[PDB]
Structures are given as C-alpha cells and as structure tokens.
Design a protein around this nucleic acid. Structure first.
Length: 70
RNA sequence: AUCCUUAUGCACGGGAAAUACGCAUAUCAGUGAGGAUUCGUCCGAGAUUGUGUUUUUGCUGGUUUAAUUAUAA
C-alpha cells in the first residue's frame, strides 16, 4: 500500500527501491508517535521534519554526480 | 593457587592473495545501509561519489701477481 503513495511515485523510477526502505522507517516511527500521543490532544511537527528529510534526501538521490576533471 | 572462555597487543612456526589494498575540510547511514522469502515474513552495516597505486613496495647477492742477491776476473 505504501509503494502507491505520493512520496514515492512522484520521483523518478531509479529512486523507488531506496525510498521504500527510507519511507517505511519514517512511517513506523510516525506510528510509534501515534501510540504515545494522548487521545485528547494529537499533534504533528515530527512528520514535518520527516517529510523534509525524505523529500530533500530524495532530491539528493536524484541529483547525480558532479562532473569530473579529466 | 591451578584450569577454562571472549576480546585486544606483541610474536616463533604454517598457508593464501595483491583486480588487490588503501585515501577524502565529501554525501548519506541502527532515528535502518544493503539484501533475502516458502509471501506469513526473514536477515542487520555499509552504500554512493572522487581518487592513488595495482604484470606490482623496499632491500640485497651473483654473473657481463710482493724483494732480492750470489760468480772464477
């Protein structure tokens, strides 16, 4: 169900295999926050950082090397 | 006091390899790299990028003739 999410297939094909392993973990931790949040008050701001890391690190995985001097 | 287990250092002795060993004011990475599956799950530390040398590193071995001096005159 994750491989069909937005944060994976919005990126080029070659990056998919690494994003699953990268996204799955960040999903689990999110759930591990949700178990600890009290029912009365549920709060974000961990998932904001955790989208930042994933999107940026994905741009970086897609960025390709710089050119090399002959 | 003896005996034993693990890890590390030094070392005698015995092998195997040098397409092998390293380096980085560099990018990520147990806050999950990289894989595996019998589809339930299972394993758990490197991967990228640049670069140095790599029929080779250091050191060695082999091969290409002294002086003195003696006759009977």
């Amino acid at each position: 169900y994750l491989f069909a999410s937005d944060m994976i297939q919005k990126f080029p094909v070659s990056v998919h295999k690494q994003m699953l392993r990268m996204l799955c973990a960040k999903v689990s931790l999110a759930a591990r926050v949700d178990a600890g949040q009290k029912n009365g008050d549920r709060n974000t701001v961990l998932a904001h950082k955790w989208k930042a890391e994933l999107s940026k690190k994905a741009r970086k995985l897609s960025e390709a090397p710089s050119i090399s001097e002959t």
